[PDB]
């Protein structure tokens, strides 16, 4: 069993259960039966039978061997952030199989730097990227593709092509954004499997919405538990498909992405330019990055 | 579903324009009100964003030459601030038939949230049959659309529920501005409660001797200033 | 669902006009209260809000030229208000049939905000019923509006019901009022303060001088910025 | 010392009035602001309350027919906005001599609260030395009286020091009110704080097109309505 | 003790403009910062409102014909941000000898609130000093003037002296700003925020674009009510 | 009183700099902690400030060339944690005369704030003398800076006489580095967080990698950004 090839589920159920959230086999694997008999109709016994298939179908469920999770490490690609600088303090740039956050004040470029790697992605891997499509969910109407367009044609990419390898969804609200993920999947496993694959996932901004429907201390609990939902959705497409997951948040409520893989806070700086710095010491070196603005979007 | 940037920059490009009718602001405004968008005006009352509003019922059904989209208008009132006979007047005064005019401008009074939330949804409805016409819906008015939310939802408890619903609400708009190509204009009385979802807000206020201040609020996409315009026939000028 | 700028502006144009029985209160409302509206009166106990509401009732049953709209009159009374001894004397005085008046005013006791909720919806009916006549419905009196409401939820947490409630109270006399071109209107004693926000035009009235009352409104635009005086007799309000 | 109902009720009509320059507001307050008393006049900023008083600098010089007191001016300026240009102005726009007008005012700038309070009492010392002459002092204006006294005491724990020395010079004015005939003319912005002992209290907003409207505050001795006015050259009218 | 209308209306005649080196914001000021006045500029750190300073400082320094006043400048420095190095480039770029100009500008380190106070009582020395020669004082600066006032007094408790002497600090430029025909110029870094509330005109800036600054009013008589764009070079503001 | 900006010019002309004794730390400091200034370095205990102090104590004695200005040292210590011996070692450490060195620091034990803020105005009469002398005081030192004050001061209503006086100390310090071209080091421990706004800078330290340090400034204004790693060892501070 991949997706819903459930025992119970037929795609009249598959439905309802993806119009509530339970959409991986995750997902079904850790509901009740209750929930889902109020979700799809089914009956709590048959519903059971659902979760119990699900339990031991779960793919990010199992187990494996350090052996053969050493090797999967080994395969991980890296993008590049455009700027030898901010590469170094990233140790070659941001990786698949993980979720990167970038956050900062408005301004700080982090949108910037999303619009840099969604071209970066593209190129050959000796040119700092894995030949690789993008996946872009959009919620604060921010995506250029004239801005991607400017940044190819001054590398020396043909921008009618890039602009080819770049797939955008507008997100309207935080339900739209966390259903938005799993129409992803369709699309990565459609273009898996050719000359591009997906490599580069995109949402930005992905708090945004959440701290803006969820006011309040009767709020802020299930903000929670839905941002956690939301990132295990982009953790697995993650994993589960060697993508790199990059995502946004604007700060200074109060709101983060607690397991992305790694946080990367930037602020303006000197004069034009902006500073990234790293927020840990586990994994990666301990200073600051300086770079700037300008066509080619990230440079330095 | 996701569409390629291709599509996507193709779609940005056939963005609209309505004029407000008034240089200064369609200047600091870069162009005027798009398409595929939500406007958002808010200030005092008397701020004269009624005002805008009307004038702008007129300026889209004009050709895109002086500054409209030769399209239709769904008008939602909810302060039952509309005024047909406002539109002849400022109609009647800036060349178009002032009997025509409210030939392509489509109302409907919502009594309260729910009410206001349902008409949206209603909208598709008129605006679906009529893009198959010479003159479609281009422009989509909500004023208020804060008001019956502020007044429905009060005490906290509830701030959670207004915002996921005023989200919903939004988000439905959204969806119409870009599944159609139509400019959404709303209106937001103020002195809380904003638009978040809203892709531009100008903020306007009364100034000096009967003239109206705008000045957007943000920096990136449009310039970094204040326009000075007058509420008049025709509506908005200068 | 929706309807065209010139149908809009044709019944807007079919708008009638209540004389207050006072030239003055009059003039401030710009004829009188309209139909296809919520007018809400509000000030403190003994502002006369009540009495404004029994001429009311009288004045909406003679012809256009003499102030009404040859009309009927649906009254719901929360408060235990209404007198129909003070129609008959305001109409006496008025030159009128206190046994005729008294023929074309029909209310109902609300004991509670359920019950003054039911009571809306069900005047439809008698609305409906009195519709195709020559004297239909043309008045519809609430008063008081919110006296229930204020009591039935106190504190917050409340809040969130009440409002809601009312809004959707208010909602139904909004449609009624358009949907039958009725003028309604509404009262609301004020010293947890409610509100009629969904209301077309409120007007505020205090006691003065003596036995005398001042009304104002509460918008610039539309209608002047300027305080009526009038006074409470036979014939209801003077002035 | 206490005088006898007899002489009180000479005095209590040996009251003056000057007049704001605008039918409709002389009318309103029943004469105009008079002697013998402190008139407080308050609303937001831009509500006209300094233009007033600049035109009550003007009409008190001219003769009682016209509804003067041929007296001169002291004024106390808190906010630096007394404009002699603008008495220029307005004077050379209703008769008198535009040159003239400015001879027989007396400025002085307060730069915070005690400064306020201690002019005042020097105010005496102009005052005195001109009783004894054709045009003696017949208009004191403070604008602002607030100002300063609700920048410097912030934070209860000052609030009732404040309104002890607030009273202490509200006190002062009332003295020199009496003590000479001389009507008090104090400004008060708003959207808190007020002259309590204010002898009238005026509130002013911006109104309509360009308009501002009165209405006191108090309902024994004067109209219960409200008055309209604009601000023009001869400062007030209407 | 008081003047006479003609003769304040006199004085104020004799009022003079600095310019701050921009067409822009100049026009926006109505030609300049004034004497007889204090002008506050606010914003948040690096709004440019030190450099505005500086430029000031030179402008003061050229004939009016040129923006100036042909007058001295009395610094009061208390963020340690008087770079006189800045001067000359102002001056250097303007076509001025930085030798010159640094000879008509006096400094002041103020360490704490005390000595700012201090500091301004004393300058009137400074003024007298140099008041009856043929380049007097014309320009006094205090930047920061809010910086050690909102670090001494902490919280509630703390704002009745702190206004009160502030008050006390602002009364004492104000006065000497009249008494010599000077212009007061004072800053306030803005995110306990104070403000110089007898300011007599008080301009916000915050940073723009790119390198930019953007300035604009905070009263709408007197002067326009529209915003002015600039930028930092070599003599300092320029646009 | 005052001073003539180009005498001014002159004054921050002859600005001295003392070297950490790490290379790295130094391109921070854009050459090392300068004199005429406080420089407030903050950090968890154990972050290695008092190490700098140490190492700031004989770094100032060796010649300019070798990143020192011939000059004594004056320190003020609160935590009983100046150590005359780790000095000797450094010193000797340092192609420096143990002993000697020491003859050119002088310390006081501070036993509270009052005592502290009483030995800072008392250096006073220290510099001036040595002041004539081949080796003026040209390092002042104050470790721990805060720590009394936190500890001395509890609750609001005391949290405001603090910062009043707190800030009449900073302002103390600020006198002397000014009016003597000293350098002023100052440190603070962190986990009421009392800071040195006044600090003409800032530079906050942490325990980092493997043993070692790593330091980073507070701002923008004046220098650049980014960190600075170094370690501890004999010679106090070194790359």
Do not use: C
Not at 87 to 112: H, M, P, R, W, Y
Not at 173 to 201: C, F, G, W, Y
Not at 224 to 252: S, W
Not at 274 to 287: F, S, V
């Amino acid at each position: 069993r991949s997706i819903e090839d459930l025992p119970g589920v037929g795609p009249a159920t598959a439905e309802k259960l993806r119009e509530a959230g339970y959409d991986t086999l995750e997902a079904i694997a850790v509901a009740s039966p209750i929930e889902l008999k109020e979700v799809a109709g089914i009956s709590e016994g048959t519903a059971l039978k659902i979760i119990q298939a699900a339990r031991k179908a779960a793919n990010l469920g199992t187990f494996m061997r350090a052996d053969e999770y050493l090797k999967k490490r080994a395969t991980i690609g890296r993008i590049s952030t455009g700027s030898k600088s901010l590469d170094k303090l990233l140790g070659g740039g941001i990786e698949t199989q993980a979720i990167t956050e970038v956050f900062g004040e408005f301004g700080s470029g982090k949108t910037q730097l999303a619009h840099t790697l969604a071209v970066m992605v593209q190129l050959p891997p000796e040119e700092g990227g894995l030949n690789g499509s993008v996946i872009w969910i959009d919620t604060e109407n921010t995506f250029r593709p004239e801005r991607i367009r400017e940044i190819a044609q001054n590398r020396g990419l043909d921008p009618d092509e890039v602009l080819k390898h770049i797939y955008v969804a507008r997100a309207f609200n935080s339900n739209h954004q966390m259903l938005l993920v799993q129409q992803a999947e369709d699309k990565i496993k459609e273009l898996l499997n050719t000359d591009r694959p997906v490599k580069l996932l995109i949402v930005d901004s992905l708090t945004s919405h959440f701290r803006s429907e969820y006011i309040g201390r009767g709020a802020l609990a299930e903000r929670q538990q839905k941002l956690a939902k939301h990132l295990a959705d982009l953790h697995r497409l993650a994993n589960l498909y060697d993508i790199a997951v990059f995502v946004t948040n604007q700060v200074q409520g109060h709101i983060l992405a607690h397991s992305a893989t790694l946080r990367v806070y930037l602020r303006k700086g000197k004069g034009g330019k902006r500073i990234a710095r790293l927020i840990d010491a586990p994994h990666l070196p301990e200073g600051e990055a300086v770079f700037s603005i300008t066509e080619k979007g990230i440079e330095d």
